[PDB]
Subunit: 310 residues, 2 copies
């Protein structure tokens, strides 16, 4: 008779995957995550058009030396931060804000973008303890995160598709990793033209998180495993007990409205090694690249919306 | 006088045979030949070579009695790859391409070491390095290794080329030759659009890829040889007549040898940083998939050959 959402919170850190901060307080998650697709959606849906207009004015005012393209890049960061700030008002934990996906193969520019996000939060009175910087888990992203963590900036290594890939993150001292459960299962279904989801025991996305969790706990890695990007509530339920799960508002609502018993299920690499191991994983090779391309398309669309409102 | 399409092609393009079978090579008279781990495995399994592994083990053990099992297997594998290259060189005037172990494809330093070991093994047999192309997968690390090998006068064949940015980086590194995999690019195109039949030549992504690389090279003054490889049918080869070079399977060479129509000549005459290369490759879903797949398939066959070796130790 307790809801599945309530029971899941007793064994796992529940995180809301959304930039629509007005939806968050219903669910009382500990943390929240945004990404370029979610920010774009929040901006396109217009509930927050005042916040957007006010952000553009402020950045223009404070940056009279920037030409058009530089001004737009700066507003795009300020927007990501303004949504994070509003999220932080309605949660007790941290918000994840993602670096521009276009710098995913450049460690130096990733480091600089990450520090810029942190500085903008600091300028707005938010200390870095409340923020995770999301970075795609290419080799360069991991190398950037290694340095950011040394400087006390916690990172959320996203677009995780392979276990070796997660192990390299942990080896770099990363705060948290996010395996993309639903996209791993999308590949599995696409491979065989499957129209129905696989049994949970045979669901590659669920199994991937299970394997990463078992590796971390047995080796004593402190990096948090946070399953992400789910296709349905059964995939979330399958991972009850995981350190953290970040869940869309639609699935959080399904978990809130479901009253059954929740069974609790869950209780060094060189660059050359990493690239070899990624190469051995056809799904991971494809999905990491695809993830960067899709987040890139959404970041470009957001820039266009900013350009239209200058 | 009138000549077959194969003999006409030799006049405008360097014709190269893509096989480890030296007897077949002999009858098409290509200038160069290319081998790879998949073709070497197929040859090794053929009845003619049933004692080749045991002989090579014998000879290799004898010359290195102090090596551990891993070290030995490795030496036998190079010896086998080189043995097929030598037999091919006995029957052609040009060069043979011999591929480094695909497992070192993300390690420039171990690629360089393997490439020099191949060159040394040929040299031990009296074959100078000007008759050999070392085949390296065109990952960024493969291009870095090739850049350094070329500096030492070791010519490389940069294989598994799927994108014009790889090809441009290879040229910028001064590599001797690049091999775009025409058939495999068309394979992706057909799977992407549920195509039941081959696209028109004008619309064939694999053919167009080589056309684009050839155009880019000539316009930039790059001397790197463009060599189209891995064809699906003879029409794709004919579509590239005039290309610097084309490496063609014996089945397709036989088709060209037997055609007699006129062959119309179709091709006539910023810098890429590592981050730029990785971004451009990332934008190309086909290239990202196909380069990784090519390394995996060559690796699977290299391991299969190692396993044949191990069961004979
Ligand atoms: Mg000679």
């Amino acid at each position: 008779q307790k809801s599945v959402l309530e029971q899941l919170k007793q064994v796992t850190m529940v995180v809301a995957d959304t930039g629509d901060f007005e939806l968050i307080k219903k669910y009382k998650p500990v943390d929240a995550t945004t990404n370029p697709s979610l920010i774009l959606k929040a901006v396109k849906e217009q509930k927050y058009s005042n916040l957007v207009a006010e952000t553009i004015s402020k950045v223009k005012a404070n940056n009279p030396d920037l030409n058009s393209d530089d001004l737009v890049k700066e507003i795009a960061i300020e927007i990501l931060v303004s949504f994070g700030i509003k999220i932080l008002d309605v949660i007790e934990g941290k918000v994840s804000s993602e670096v521009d996906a276009r710098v995913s193969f450049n460690s130096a520019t990733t480091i600089d973008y990450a520090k810029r996000i942190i500085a903008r939060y600091e300028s707005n009175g938010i200390p870095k303890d409340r923020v995770l910087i999301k970075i795609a888990a290419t080799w360069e992203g991991i190398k950037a995160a290694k340095l950011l963590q040394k400087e006390g900036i916690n990172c959320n290594l996203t677009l995780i598709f392979d276990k070796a890939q997660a192990k390299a993150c942990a080896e770099a001292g990363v705060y948290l990793v996010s395996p993309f459960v639903g996209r791993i299962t999308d590949w599995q279904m696409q491979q065989n033209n499957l129209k129905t989801f696989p049994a949970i025991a045979d669901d590659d996305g669920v199994n991937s998180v299970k394997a990463i969790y078992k590796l971390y706990k047995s080796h004593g890695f402190k990096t948090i495993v946070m399953g992400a990007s789910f296709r349905n509530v059964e995939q979330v339920i399958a991972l009850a007990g995981c350190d953290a799960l970040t869940i869309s508002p639609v699935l959080l609502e399904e978990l809130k409205n479901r009253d059954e018993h929740l069974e609790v299920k869950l209780t060094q690499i060189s660059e050359a090694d990493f690239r070899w191991l990624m190469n051995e994983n056809a799904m991971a090779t494809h999905k990491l690249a695809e993830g960067i391309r899709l987040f890139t398309k959404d970041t470009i669309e957001l820039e266009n919306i900013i350009k239209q409102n200058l």
